[PDB]
C-alpha cells in the first residue's frame, strides 16, 4: 500500500531527528 509507505518515509526522517546520536530500529508492519 502506498500512503502507508509515504508515512514511513517521514517517520524515519522524524525518528532520525528525534533520536539523533542514540539511533533507532525501524520495523514496518
Site for other proteins contains 9 (CB under 8 A): no
Cell numbers found for residue 25: 530500529
Tell me which of 4, 5, 6, 25 binds Zn ion, using CB under 5 A.
Answer: 6
How many whole angstroms separate alpha carbon 29 and alpha carbon 20? 23
Site for its own copies contains 10 (CB under 8 A): yes
How many whole angstroms separate alpha carbon 16 and alpha carbon 1? 23
Q: Contact at 8 Å (CB) between 12 and 26?
A: yes
Which residues lie near ligand MYR (CB under 6 A)? 1-4, 7, 28-29
Site for its own copies contains 1 (CB under 8 A): no
- Give the residues lining the site for Zn ion (CB under 5 A): 6
Amino acid at each position: 500500500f502506498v500512503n502507508q509507505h509515504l508515512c514511513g518515509s517521514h517517520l524515519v526522517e522524524a525518528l532520525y531527528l528525534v533520536c539523533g546520536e542514540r539511533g533507532f530500529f525501524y520495523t514496518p508492519k
